[PDB]
Amino acid sequence: LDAVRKRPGMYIGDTDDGTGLHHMVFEVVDNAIDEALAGHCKEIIVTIHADNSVSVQDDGRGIPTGIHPEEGVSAAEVIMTVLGVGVSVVNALSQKLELVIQREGKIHRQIYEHGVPQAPLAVTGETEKTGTMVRFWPSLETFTNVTEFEYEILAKRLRELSFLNSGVSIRLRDKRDGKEDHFHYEGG
Amino acid sequence: LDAVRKRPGMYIGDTDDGTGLHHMVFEVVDNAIDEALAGHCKEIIVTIHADNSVSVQDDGRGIPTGIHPEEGVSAAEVIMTVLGVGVSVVNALSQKLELVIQREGKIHRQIYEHGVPQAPLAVTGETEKTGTMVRFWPSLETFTNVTEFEYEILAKRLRELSFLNSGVSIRLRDKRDGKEDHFHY
Numbered sequence A: 001l002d003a004v005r006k007r008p009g010m011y012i013g014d015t016d017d018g019t020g021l022h023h024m025v026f027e028v029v030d031n032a033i034d035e036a037l038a039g040h041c042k043e044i045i046v047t048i049h050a051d052n053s054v055s056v057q058d059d060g061r062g063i064p065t066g067i068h069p070e071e072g073v074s075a076a077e078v079i080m081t082v083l084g085v086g087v088s089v090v091n092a093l094s095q096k097l098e099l100v101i102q103r104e105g106k107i108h109r110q111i112y113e114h115g116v117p118q119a120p121l122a123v124t125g126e127t128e129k130t131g132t133m134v135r136f137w138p139s140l141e142t143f144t145n146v147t148e149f150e151y152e153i154l155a156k157r158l159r160e161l162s163f164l165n166s167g168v169s170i171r172l173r174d175k176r177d178g179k180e181d182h183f184h185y186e187g188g
Numbered sequence B: 001l002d003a004v005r006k007r008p009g010m011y012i013g014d015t016d017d018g019t020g021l022h023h024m025v026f027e028v029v030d031n032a033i034d035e036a037l038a039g040h041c042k043e044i045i046v047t048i049h050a051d052n053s054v055s056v057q058d059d060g061r062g063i064p065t066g067i068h069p070e071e072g073v074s075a076a077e078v079i080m081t082v083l084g085v086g087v088s089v090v091n092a093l094s095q096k097l098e099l100v101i102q103r104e105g106k107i108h109r110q111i112y113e114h115g116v117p118q119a120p121l122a123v124t125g126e127t128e129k130t131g132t133m134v135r136f137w138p139s140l141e142t143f144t145n146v147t148e149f150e151y152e153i154l155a156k157r158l159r160e161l162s163f164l165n166s167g168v169s170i171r172l173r174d175k176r177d178g179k180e181d182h183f184h185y
């Protein structure tokens, strides 16, 4: 990840005017849509939290959690730490990132800070559901000037995305003011 | 450097009891001793600053500044960012690190933050002197409980080194309370 840390602008885009900041969300959303399309129900929920973090969750199969034979860490960690631009870029430029994977009846949890895992991916409990949740806090060391998520930029993009992804429910939530939208196109 | 960031204790030593914190200084000092050996005068200065950073200076030749043909960046940056455990470990676990190299009539400067160079090694002026200086601010995200440098832990180790490295002068300075020592065999 040091290559991304060395020149963030080359990977995420302009880190001053807010375009790079919102690209962080849309990179995560693209991965969530890929996960949602693999299942039948297919819903993602994008939430803008009051601390200016954004969480994206889906009810798909869940990111692979088993240990990678070569890398010697969870497949999830390999995806988060090895270089669309990839979620590893988002992780690298996030001062905090929370990963929660529900898979094979188990809840898996891991925390990153500036791309560095704070502990190995851990099974913390049980669940009947499946899916992946990524919540990230953009690094204020990288993202300057424009540091807050604009609802309209996300809402417009997710609406456009819904028509290209049939059967995928996309919910948008703003916990700062309680604003909510639901984009679900069932065509084809 | 991510391997070091992932498990800091395994590279530097215990990050809670002050062991790892002081090893950061000793790793930099080992490099300074190598430089202050092939030079003439042969002196190192270790300074504890009021803002809880430590700087190590030598009056050697200056570490190589030219571009590493394989890596495509300055030889100095390769030493600071690629894996005694090496100064790259100290860089990775320092919230800031300042590098100043005086070599071939030129002063060179570079700043790192958590092991990440903020710009390429750059020529900032002219000088007749030679040597290298590294000042580092240990990361308070890594180093907990014992965060401040104890003078006597440094003084003890630098004394041991002065006997082993008989040709080298070692000065220790504390800018917090004005305390100082000069170890020379």
Ligand SMILES: COC(=O)c1ccc(O)cc1
Residues within 6 Å of the ligand: A028, A031, A032, A033, A035, A056, A057, A058, A063, A079, A087, A132, A133, A134
């Ligand atoms: C690579 O997968 C992800 O990073 C991801 C993030 C959020 C999701 O909801 C699903 C996948």
Ligand SMILES: COC(=O)c1ccc(O)cc1
Residues within 6 Å of the ligand: B028, B029, B031, B032, B033, B035, B056, B057, B058, B063, B079, B087, B132, B133, B134
């Ligand atoms: C190898 O380069 C160094 O890291 C270094 C640090 C302090 C010195 O005084 C000399 C070299």
Ligand SMILES: Nc1nc2ccccc2[nH]1
Residues within 6 Å of the ligand: A005, A113, A114, A116, A141, B005, B113, B114, B116, B141
């Ligand atoms: N604050 C901060 N910034 C960082 C950048 C890279 C790795 C760790 C870091 N901690």
